Design a protein around this ligand. Structure first.
Ligand SMILES: Nc1ncnc2c1ncn2[C@@H]1O[C@H](COP(=O)(O)OP(=O)(O)O)[C@@H](O)[C@H]1O
Lengths: 29, 237, 131
């Protein structure tokens, strides 16, 4: 009834580092 | 690592705690990245885990920097700032930790000033550092303003031009100690004044102080006879 | 071998030549992207085939560390030294295990001897301020 943002927050939070790390490994070659 | 690098590292640690900016001006090929990546491992007091180092460099060097951390000292994680505007933004936003060190093109730092200035880069590397040799440059005018404590210059060959360009590098290292480029003529004996200024904050080598078993260059001045079509156009000019 | 030149137009002429004599070659003008520089470098190191690399002294060379080169050629010289000195040592460095040879190509009585004379005069001034 009030904690309902958490199941939205986690889905964005896991995207942040993943896409930044993906782009930081286009920097491999 | 090697002995001259380890002397340079204890020299760096002394200047770092003394609050002194300086130049690792050793000859090209003696290894200024290897002589400075060890800062994160030697200055072990978690400052470098709570807040970022940053590297300011010419675009071609963004080759080895994002590689060398991963093989010399992989303990510290790295996020370069180069590539498309949208892609570098998607890397950067979350600095508002993984950000132990960041690697940069001069032609990006000269533009994205606010977006670097909002983060407290504790300690600075600036690289192939002859790029700052003029105070007329928008690079020099901007790069003076980042609130880092210690600035370290990786000059592949230091200095080596007219006195305003000596002043331009020196006045980036120290914002104090120097009055003007016009007066700095007085700061044979003026060479000894420059040496006694530089000795406490610039290192020196000559390769033979390290390279007991690597070749000297054979160097050939090869003259060429220019052709008929060349003589005809050259004479017409 | 590394070849340095100061005109992208001359790097085009050198490319058309090295294509034509079937050398295998690779080039890095200031118009090349950062990912492309990293690709060309990592393919000039690590590989046995690519004979010759084409560069500019003020973009192609900067700290780029081509330890796989045995030799260096200057098809051009700059009005300042140090850029050539860096250009040599972007091959001549601690990662080599080899002899080193460097060549400069110059035309007598033209204009390149003024560039060499200013380069010598500057190199003599530039020594005493270090050692
Ligand atoms: N122990 C080492 N193992 C491998 N490479 C090393 C080592 N020590 C130094 N280097 C070399 O030193 C150079 C790192 O410093 P860099 O900034 O690239 O060169 P420079 O001193 O010419 O400016 C690289 O060529 C690197 O391979």
């Amino acid at each position: 009834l009030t904690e309902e943002m958490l199941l939205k927050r986690e889905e964005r939070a896991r995207k942040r580092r993943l896409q930044a790390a993906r782009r930081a490994e286009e920097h491999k070659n | 690592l090697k002995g001259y690098q380890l002397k340079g590292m204890n020299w760096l640690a002394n200047l770092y705690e003394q609050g002194i900016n300086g130049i690792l001006a050793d000859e090209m090929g003696l290894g200024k990245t290897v002589q400075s990546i060890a800062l994160l491992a030697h200055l072990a007091e978690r400052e470098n885990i709570w807040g970022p180092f940053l590297i300011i460099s010419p675009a071609s060097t963004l080759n080895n920097w994002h590689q060398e951390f991963t093989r010399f000292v992989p303990k510290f994680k790295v996020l370069p700032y180069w590539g498309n505007p949208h892609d570098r933004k998607v890397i950067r936003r979350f600095w508002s930790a993984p950000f132990h060190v960041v690697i940069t093109s001069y032609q990006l730092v000269v533009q994205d000033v606010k977006y670097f200035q909002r983060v407290k880069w504790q300690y600075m590397v600036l690289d192939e550092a002859q790029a700052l040799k003029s105070s007329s440059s928008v690079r020099w005018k901007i790069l003076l303003q980042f609130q880092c404590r210690n600035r370290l210059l990786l000059t592949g060959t230091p200095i080596q031009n007219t006195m305003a360009e000596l002043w331009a590098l020196l006045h980036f290292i120290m914002p104090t100690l120097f009055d003007s480029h016009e007066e700095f003529n007085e700061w044979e004996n003026q060479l000894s004044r420059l040496h006694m200024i530089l000795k406490p904050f610039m290192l020196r080598r000559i390769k033979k102080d390290v390279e007991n078993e690597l070749s000297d260059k054979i160097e050939i001045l090869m003259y060429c006879q220019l052709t008929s079509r060349q003589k005809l156009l050259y004479q017409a000019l | 071998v590394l070849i340095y030149s100061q005109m992208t137009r001359m790097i085009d002429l050198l490319e058309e030549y090295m294509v034509y004599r079937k050398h295998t070659y690779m080039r890095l003008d200031g118009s090349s992207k950062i990912s492309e520089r990293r690709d060309m470098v990592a393919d000039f190191q690590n590989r046995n085939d690519i004979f010759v690399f084409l560069l500019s002294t003020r973009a192609g060379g900067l700290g780029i560390n081509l330890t796989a080169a045995d030799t260096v050629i200057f098809y051009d010289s700059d009005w300042n030294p140090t850029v050539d000195q860096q250009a040599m040592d972007r091959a001549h460095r601690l990662g080599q295990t080899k002899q080193v040879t460097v060549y400069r190509l110059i035309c007598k009585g033209t204009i390149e001897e003024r560039i060499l004379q200013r380069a010598k005069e500057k190199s003599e001034i530039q020594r005493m301020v270090i050692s």
